[PDB]
Amino acid sequence: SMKVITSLISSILLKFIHKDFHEIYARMSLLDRFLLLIVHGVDKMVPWHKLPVFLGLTYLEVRRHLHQQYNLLNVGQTPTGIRFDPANYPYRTADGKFNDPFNEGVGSQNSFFGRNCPPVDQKSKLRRPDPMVVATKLLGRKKFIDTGKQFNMIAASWIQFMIHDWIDHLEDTHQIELVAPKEVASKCPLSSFRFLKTKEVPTGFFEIKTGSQNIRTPWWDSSVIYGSNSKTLDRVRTYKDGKLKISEETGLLLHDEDGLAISGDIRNSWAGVSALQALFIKEHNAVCDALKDEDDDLEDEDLYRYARLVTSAVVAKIHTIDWTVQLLKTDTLLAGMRANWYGLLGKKFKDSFGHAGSSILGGVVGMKKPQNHGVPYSLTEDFTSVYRMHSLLPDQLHILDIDDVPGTNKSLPLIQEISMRDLIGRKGEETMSHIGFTKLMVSMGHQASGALELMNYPMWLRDIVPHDPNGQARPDHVDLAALEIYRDRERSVPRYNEFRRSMFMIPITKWEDLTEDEEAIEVLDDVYDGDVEELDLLVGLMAEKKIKGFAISETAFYIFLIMATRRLEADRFFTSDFNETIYTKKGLEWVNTTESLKDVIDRHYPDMTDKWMNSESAFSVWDSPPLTKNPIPLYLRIPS
Ligand code: HEM
Ligand SMILES: CCCCCCCCCO[C@@H]1O[C@H](CO)[C@@H](O)[C@H](O)[C@H]1O
Ligand SMILES: [Ca+2]
Ligand SMILES: [Ca+2]
Ligand SMILES: [Ca+2]
Numbered sequence: 001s002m003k004v005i006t007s008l009i010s011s012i013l014l015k016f017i018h019k020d021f022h023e024i025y026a027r028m029s030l031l032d033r034f035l036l037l038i039v040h041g042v043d044k045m046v047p048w049h050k051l052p053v054f055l056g057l058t059y060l061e062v063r064r065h066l067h068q069q070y071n072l073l074n075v076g077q078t079p080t081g082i083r084f085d086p087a088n089y090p091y092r093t094a095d096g097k098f099n100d101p102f103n104e105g106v107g108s109q110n111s112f113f114g115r116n117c118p119p120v121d122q123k124s125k126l127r128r129p130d131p132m133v134v135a136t137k138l139l140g141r142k143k144f145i146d147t148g149k150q151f152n153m154i155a156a157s158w159i160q161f162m163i164h165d166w167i168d169h170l171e172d173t174h175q176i177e178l179v180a181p182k183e184v185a186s187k188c189p190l191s192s193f194r195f196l197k198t199k200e201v202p203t204g205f206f207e208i209k210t211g212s213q214n215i216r217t218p219w220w221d222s223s224v225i226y227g228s229n230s231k232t233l234d235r236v237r238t239y240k241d242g243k244l245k246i247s248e249e250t251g252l253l254l255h256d257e258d259g260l261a262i263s264g265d266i267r268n269s270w271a272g273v274s275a276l277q278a279l280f281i282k283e284h285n286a287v288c289d290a291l292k293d294e295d296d297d298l299e300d301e302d303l304y305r306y307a308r309l310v311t312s313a314v315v316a317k318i319h320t321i322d323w324t325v326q327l328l329k330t331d332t333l334l335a336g337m338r339a340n341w342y343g344l345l346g347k348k349f350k351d352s353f354g355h356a357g358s359s360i361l362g363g364v365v366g367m368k369k370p371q372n373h374g375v376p377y378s379l380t381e382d383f384t385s386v387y388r389m390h391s392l393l394p395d396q397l398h399i400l401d402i403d404d405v406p407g408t409n410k411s412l413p414l415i416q417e418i419s420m421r422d423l424i425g426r427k428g429e430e431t432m433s434h435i436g437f438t439k440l441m442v443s444m445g446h447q448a449s450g451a452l453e454l455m456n457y458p459m460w461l462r463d464i465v466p467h468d469p470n471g472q473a474r475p476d477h478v479d480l481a482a483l484e485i486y487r488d489r490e491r492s493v494p495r496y497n498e499f500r501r502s503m504f505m506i507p508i509t510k511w512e513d514l515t516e517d518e519e520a521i522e523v524l525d526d527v528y529d530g531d532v533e534e535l536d537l538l539v540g541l542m543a544e545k546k547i548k549g550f551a552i553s554e555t556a557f558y559i560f561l562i563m564a565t566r567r568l569e570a571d572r573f574f575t576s577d578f579n580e581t582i583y584t585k586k587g588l589e590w591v592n593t594t595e596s597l598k599d600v601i602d603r604h605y606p607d608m609t610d611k612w613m614n615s616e617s618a619f620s621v622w623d624s625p626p627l628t629k630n631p632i633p634l635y636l637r638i639p640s
């Protein structure tokens with residue numbers, strides 16, 4: 001046969017593949033071996049992010065395909081259940097069941113986290129090197145480093161607002177204690193701290209024998225405002241006109257008898273997230289008003305269901321084509337992220353002529369069927385690790401004088417600095433009640449986030465009161481930087497270099513491959529006793545030299561590449577059921593005409609961005625100078 005001869009040639013070409021990929025290679029199809037040869041070839045020459053946009057996009061299409069085929073690992077028995085008719089569930093269910101037309105429990109509350117990379121058992125190394133040493137020497141903020149004008153505090157609030165929709169790990173009842181070693185104890189805000197073990201649930205399989213459970217629905221269903229089950233949904237519903245609870249007077253969240261905010265998920269939250277919850281409750285309630293006017297025969301439950309479909313799709317769209325484009329501020333990713341939604345052919349073509357039929361040309365949104373690449377949808381252990389972005393948070397929020405006349409580029413002066421401790425949890429709700437929605441939002445818009453670099457982890461997070469899932473305070477404080485290191489190890493996520501190999505990225509051989517910062521190299525060498533194989537994932541992701549324009553590492557980005565696409569393409573409500581029958585005509589129109597966070601702010605606060613936002617995106621620092629558009633066609637642009 002020709003297939004056997006070509007496979008022999010593929011075995012010959014194995015001489016051009018990095019030795020660490022020989023294993024994953026044997027598991028690949030013939031065409032995919034050729035594709036890996038091409039991807040790996042580019043990696044060794046001019047890298048994709050230096051290519052003309054159209055070639056960068058071609059590279060990313062091929063790499064993403066490889067990850068879809070080889071970096072999606074199921075965990076646990078698939079919760080298939082008895083066969084059901086998806087037409088019986090033309091709405092987002094309270095616990096995320098009945099979305100995958102073939103598996104009732106996929107994407108539901110308490111489903112298993114899947115994986116992208118094979119697990120690496122680290123139970124004998126949970127404290128090697130010591131996580132409080134790692135936190136002290138490599139993570140704790142020395143001098144604040146910001147993100148320039150690229151990514152403001154609304155953008156930092158937004159990604160946490162998404163984490164509250166996406167991922168949270170079920171805990172066991174067993175307590176763990178970490179103790180600060182003598183060497184760093186005087187630099188540790190806590191000399192020791194206690195927390196709960198992650199719940200390890202047996203799977204019944206050989207390759208992956210235990211898994212974690214996700215207590216948030218992994219569907220992108222806005223469970224951050226709707227809850228992840230019927231009980232928590234019931235708490236937010238008014239049962240009038242489809243609506244959710246909010247203060248009519250202040251536009252802020254309501255609070256329960258303990259002063260805790262009433263929303264979908266408020267765990268370990270802060271004022272910035274509360275602001276976005278309130279904004280999107282206003283969005284949901286505005287959709288209810290529009291649909292109830294159109295049709296007086298719709299009852300509360302009908303209104304709620306349609307408005308949840310519209311609101312959750314608006315959020316997903318804004319994240320995809322506005323937020324991500326600020327995180328990944330390059331021409332290639334502008335083109336790429338917009339293509340996820342609208343296809344390479346573009347919005348104007350799609351809006352005029354409809355979906356072209358392939359994800360490449362028309363976007364994953366509106367595809368005829370959901371796509372899971374043969375692996376039941378989940379968010380993964382690896383996804384959790386790469387979204388650990390706590391260094392985005394500042395030490396203080398800079399509250400501006402919104403009563404002052406805006407200056408050049410709509411700049412405003414500082415009126416007060418507020419410690420982040422005063423803006424988190426219950427205390428933060430009280431502080432926000434005095435500041436108000438407008439002042440907080442404008443101040444967040446004008447303030448840069450922290451950068452994802454070493455030695456930039458807020459020290460206030462090294463002694464925080466953590467919460468139970470309902471937002472209730474725990475008596476045992478945690479050092480979050482040390483805890484994150486422990487969790488990645490506890491949950492068997494590969495450390496940095498093995499993570500790279502698993503994602504067919506060339507591994508580092510020395511610290512100089514990771515970063516040009518000579519003092520950071522010395523710290524890494526100290527903490528890890530020279531061993532790049534012991535380098536923690538979180539540390540590597542913060543340390544890695546950034547592609548120009550990227551706020552995250554390339555290693556994190558490849559997980560974003562595949563998993564962001566997956567959140568849309570696997571979900572019926574973004575694919576087979578993204579249509580006017582399911583959304584209503586007006587509901588679909590609402591999604592299709594909303595392109596940005598600015599559009600939503602302008603809907604509810606009609607004068608805010610005119611007065612105070614000079615940037616194009618509400619996620620960029622608001623007093624940015626005007627920019628003249630690049631006259632070179634997008635798909636032809638060459639990165640400098
Ligand atoms: C005031 C703001 C925040 C506070 C107080 C906070 C606190 C916490 C705490 C206490 C945990 C759980 C640690 C554990 O027991 O395992 C956690 C987990 C996490 N946080 Fe934050 N965080 C905040 C903001 C953010 C931001 C801005 C991001 C950026 C993406 C983020 C991403 C995550 C992720 C991905 C997890 C892991 C969830 C899991 O284990 O499933 N957080 N955070
Ligand atoms: C799946 C892979 C898809 C993209 C592969 C692109 C191959 C690289 C093309 O090299 C060409 O010659 C130059 C030398 O001067 C390059 O550096 C330049 O950028 C490019 O135009
Ligand atoms: Ca969810
Ligand atoms: Ca009580
Ligand atoms: Ca009617």
Ligand SMILES: [Ca+2]
Pocket residue numbers: 401404413
């Ligand atoms: Ca003044």
Ligand SMILES: [Ca+2]
Pocket residue numbers: 411412446623
């Ligand atoms: Ca300013």
Ligand SMILES: [Ca+2]
Pocket residue numbers: 519522523
């Ligand atoms: Ca030194």
Ligand SMILES: [Ca+2]
Pocket residue numbers: 593594595
């Ligand atoms: Ca519009």
Ligand SMILES: [Ca+2]
Pocket residue numbers: 606607610
């Ligand atoms: Ca006006």
Ligand SMILES: [Cl-]
Pocket residue numbers: 229231232
């Ligand atoms: Cl519950």
Ligand SMILES: [Cl-]
Pocket residue numbers: 324560564
């Ligand atoms: Cl994303």
Ligand SMILES: [Cl-]
Pocket residue numbers: 591592593
């Ligand atoms: Cl759209």
